[PDB]
Assembly symmetry: C4
Homo-oligomer: 316 residues x 4
């Protein structure tokens, strides 16, 4: 009677299984793909949020091997100048760089009509990848905007999202995206779920999206619901090529905002706890992933993504 498509799993419903291994944490290879034609050295990209990514964080992340997405809450000119500032930026052996030896950078735009001028300025400033972000990637208007952008820029790497289903992933692929970003109500008690009743637990969302996207060689980016480094491992093993994070980098030295002192503690203000330099965070998070790769015998990210197994666990 009730129309239940299936049962859906989140991070806490599963654990990775240890396996025969010739991989040590320090020999694990963290390289992977953001898009069809863009390699990463670590599987982390930063969210296009105005408390997370401007040029300075985008530089610092690229130097550690990820890519940052410059946020769209600023003028066209400011957004293009920040993209440009990352591309011309000149001890960092894992730096994520293009074919021309420049730090990679991404930038976000909205899916509403009228963003053409912004896209054009971003591409002319040398952006490596354009993110069309939306709260509903399976919306026809979003699909339409992606197709228009792919036609106007046939060689531009474009990430479209967010979706949480096989059919949503396929629609984005058919609209021309270079990667599928996944996450609709991915957090266990998030606003979307509470307010709308809509959501898909993220391990199932990633796997369903990856099952389609794998057949085209198109990466899936996991966006949301990550609380601990162990969730990164799980998101990859479910099918994701990398993870997007936001609040985890908000509050770092390199993130926007000014440090202020308030009641004997340090916050960033525009208030979020001060987290020190981005790279210490990356080191701790990637130190968990590397241990997982040791325990699972995953030499490469792709081995974790396509071969590692899970067990299903109870609440207890």
């Amino acid at each position: 009677m009730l129309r239940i498509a299936k049962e859906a799993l989140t991070f806490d419903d599963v654990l990775l299984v240890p396996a025969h291994s010739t991989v040590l944490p320090n020999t694990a290879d963290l390289r992977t793909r953001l898009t069809k034609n863009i390699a990463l050295n670590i599987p982390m990209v930063s969210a296009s949020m105005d408390t997370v990514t401007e040029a300075r964080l985008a530089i610092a992340l690229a130097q550690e091997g990820g890519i940052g997405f410059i946020h769209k809450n600023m003028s066209i000119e400011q957004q293009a100048a920040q993209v440009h500032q990352v591309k011309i930026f000149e001890s960092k052996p894992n730096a994520c760089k293009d074919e021309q030896g420049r730090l990679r950078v991404g930038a976000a735009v909205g899916a509403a009509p009228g963003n053409e001028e912004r896209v054009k300025a971003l591409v002319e400033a040398g952006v490596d990848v354009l993110l069309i972000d939306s709260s509903h990637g399976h919306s026809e208007g979003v699909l339409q905007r992606i197709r228009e952008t792919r036609a106007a820029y046939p060689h531009l790497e474009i990430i479209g999202g967010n979706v949480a289903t096989a059919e949503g992933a396929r629609a984005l692929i058919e609209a021309g995206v270079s990667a599928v970003k996944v996450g609709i109500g991915p957090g266990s008690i998030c606003t979307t779920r509470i307010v709308t009743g809509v959501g898909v637990p993220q391990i199932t969302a990633i796997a369903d999206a990856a099952g389609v996207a794998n057949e085209y060689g198109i990466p899936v980016i996991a966006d949301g619901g990550i609380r601990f480094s162990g969730d990164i491992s799980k998101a990859i093993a479910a099918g994701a090529s990398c993870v997007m994070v936001g609040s985890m980098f908000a509050g770092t030295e390199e993130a926007p905002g000014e440090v202020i002192l308030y009641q004997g503690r340090s916050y960033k203000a525009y208030r979020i706890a001060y987290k020190g330099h981005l790279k210490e965070i990356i080191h701790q998070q990637m130190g968990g992933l590397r241990s997982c790769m040791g325990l699972t015998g995953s030499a490469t990210v792709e081995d974790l993504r396509t071969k590692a197994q899970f067990v299903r666990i109870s609440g207890a």
Copy 2:
């Protein structure tokens, strides 16, 4: 050995699945049905509780497109005068009105013998729909009272309830109701469950009742267990044509009770927190439903009710 009819699901066991959509939140159509012959403009009706619905709230809700049920804890004459006050009440484009251009209103009576005089006064005051409320709609005495009322008023829209099963819905339909109200121990830790051991999780209760009621074109009204706007969406997708709420409207300006100040805060007394004007509540709750309809591609309430899908989730 144990006589278990089936497993039963509540709101928290499920989430709605996002889908291809050409619907924006602001173009979603919230119209639906309360009864077989009564249309609503929004899918909300108010409970016949003495802290929730008298004429003033019933007017204000009807103006926003719902219908209120005037409570029976007052004299026959007072109840009829309040029905009349709504019907003659004269900027509200979504107002819920009858064929004669008057605001719709409902009124409740009990299912005990001896309520004949009350029903007669309510029908003569112009009531649009009579609610026979009971804590057990599958009780023979309730079925009998409904059949007596249907025979005495063959064209009166009558809501009977509450039931929580297919067979209870069918019994009410066979007794002559125009809509089936659903909810027996619908709340996760309610008094009925704790004290009696009886209850049916509401998503399953709605679906089982709707599976019968759909075959007769008879709407199901979901009554109880709603905590957030996202639960409204889920109740509709499970089969309900609209939701009845109570405590959510108690404490509004338009609800009964006098505002009083107590320890620097505003309460309503007859003590419940003051919630401001009813319409702000409706706007927030229907703003969640409209977002859900966007995310699910549901152009109309009936699309959400009959086509949207769920996923089943764990506790974790």
Copy 3:
């Protein structure tokens, strides 16, 4: 690989289903059986605990229609004198009485060798039913003591317990008991479970025991894990003819202990909160059961026990 006999359910895993009913709470018939040859007027008996049952509580409970089990932590002579005091005790239309018009009473003894003198004094004082209590009714020594007692007193009603399985119920029946008492680690976080790892969720324990005991006409008594009146209903619907309670009656006026005042509140000391007269407790607990019987259409206890249905629910 793991030797799992089955999944087992507790009270919180299930709810009773409402059904067509011609039963009102006040016409529900609460009569039932304690043992094969002893009728009760309500389905409650009191535990043989020294904070719960001596003669005074046993009198008061019998007057309301249950039976109390006088505890064994006192001399033979004192125990026999308390049994006698109940039997000769002379406005209580539901009183539980024997064939001779005397209030019924039970009494407990241990299952160790050497209790013969105690049993003999109790039977000579007129006890209606002997409870051989043990923490493991499937222990051979307990079975042996029951068989010895049945042989020495072929017409004495004997309750043996506790068991939590079909095979344990059958063993007790084959040893000669007149009723099977059920409950091994029945509480969700009890000492037995934590300390020993052993336990059986009580709804499954009752049902498994009843599935055997029904075939011999032998009642099952549910002992433990009851927190609310709704659990009484569930225990009966799972197969139990009545429930034994303990802490629920401890602290009543009629229970042992002296009332004392401590920090502006009343306790019973030998410290447990003062609960007033036993009969108010019985009235509230049986008021829940009667509502359940109305909602389920159960005219009699046996209808609830053998026909009412459950639904299985999640944690959420």
Copy 4:
């Protein structure tokens, strides 16, 4: 789509089933095996942690019938002198002793290359069993070190670990271990799970490892996730021959550290609550196991391990 090997159970998902019994708690036989050729009198061994086991605790545990593993965080000479101190140590009828009448003792070493000198000193000091401990027993380097040690000391009892799967147990057996130690992310919220995403609920881990190890006569030692004595019972019934504990013995008189007074309480410092003498702990924990053996009719540890049954329970 998602690669889920199976569902996995932890201690809280299961309970032991009571059964016909001729065993009393005081007649239960607690003997078992640590390794293929080493008997224990109780099923407890202590962890090779520097807050848990040095010579003094190892002596005291051996006297109660277990075996302690002297930790490796000290010089070769100190470790060998502590092994020797236990072997020459001279009212304890359950003492665990070798063929020569000396208290048994174990000692740990790491799995890195270069521990040869340490192993040699430990074997020459008379160690009964060598533990090669690792956080990943299915790592090739660990398997290789075990095989090298087995070849150099063909008659030395060697415990290898930790694994959490059938295949990991088989690999360790094929590398030459005398017992398999089990536990990879065995605790419900441990660091390994949170940080790496890897883990196997312990009841399933034990059973899977035992299903392989039983076919070779090789014992499984359960290491981690034990909170209460009831978990010991469950770990044995899942397949384990004994349990290793750590924090449970930390803080005992006999464990390392000096007692200090801090804010009116006693702690051990190197800060952990003071627990008194080891033997009181053993008595309480083995008193739970003995009650379980009574309730399950398990005369011996091997009966609990190979015949006792479980039920599966919900969260509720």
